[PDB]
């Protein structure tokens, strides 16, 4: 694989059960800072700041009418709202130009409104 370039900030992450901290397993947190070495995610449930490796973090799927961010592709670092999704892919609308674009859910990350 060697695909560790799938780390984006402002997106929600899911603690995989493979994480050593079983107390944070299944818990969701927000990514504040990203570092090729490690990732910094804040656990909303733990209300604390902790750093987790992308291998221990899981991407969250954005819901309709929800904000999503391109974590992969040339549009990386781009944000937008999801208007609909295709069982085969995921159609999203760019909140910047309001233009509609189609992207696989694998490249769509769920953002936390908070």
From Swiss-Prot:
What are the TM regions of this chain, as residue ranges?
A: none
Q: Which body tissues produce this protein? A: Ubiquitously expressed.
Subcellular location(s) of the protein = Nucleus
**Cross-link type Glycyl lysine isopeptide (Lys-Gly) (interchain with G-Cter in SUMO2), residue numbers:** 64
Q: Indicate where the modification Phosphothreonine is found in the sequence.
A: 61
Q: Which residues pair up as cystines?
A: none
Q: How is it modified after translation?
A: Methylated by PRMT1/HRMT1L2 and PRMT5/SKB1. Methylation negatively regulates interaction with P-TEFb and RNA polymerase II. Phosphorylated by CDK7 and CDK9. Phosphorylation by P-TEFb (CDK9) at Thr residues of the C-terminal repeats alleviates transcriptional pausing and promotes transcription elongation. Dephosphorylated by the INTAC complex when transcripts are unfavorably configured for transcriptional elongation, leading to premature transcription termination: dephosphorylation is mediated by the PPP2CA component of the INTAC complex. Dephosphorylated by the PNUTS-PP1 complex in termination zones downstream of poly(A) sites, thereby promoting deceleration of RNA polymerase II transcription.
Family membership, please give it: Belongs to the SPT5 family.
Its annotated function is as follows:
Component of the DRB sensitivity-inducing factor complex (DSIF complex), which regulates mRNA processing and transcription elongation by RNA polymerase II. DSIF positively regulates mRNA capping by stimulating the mRNA guanylyltransferase activity of RNGTT/CAP1A. DSIF also acts cooperatively with the negative elongation factor complex (NELF complex) to enhance transcriptional pausing at sites proximal to the promoter. Transcriptional pausing may facilitate the assembly of an elongation competent RNA polymerase II complex.
Give the record's subunit note. Interacts with SUPT4H1 to form DSIF. DSIF interacts with the positive transcription elongation factor b complex (P-TEFb complex), which is composed of CDK9 and cyclin-T (CCNT1 or CCNT2). DSIF interacts with RNA polymerase II (Pol II); forms DNA and RNA clamps that stabilize Pol II elongation complex while maintaining the nontemplate DNA strand in the transcription bubble and nascent RNA in the exit channel. This interaction is reduced by phosphorylation of the C-terminal domain (CTD) of POLR2A by P-TEFb.
Indicate what this protein is called per its UniProt record. Answer: Transcription elongation factor SPT5
Gene name linked to the record: SUPT5H
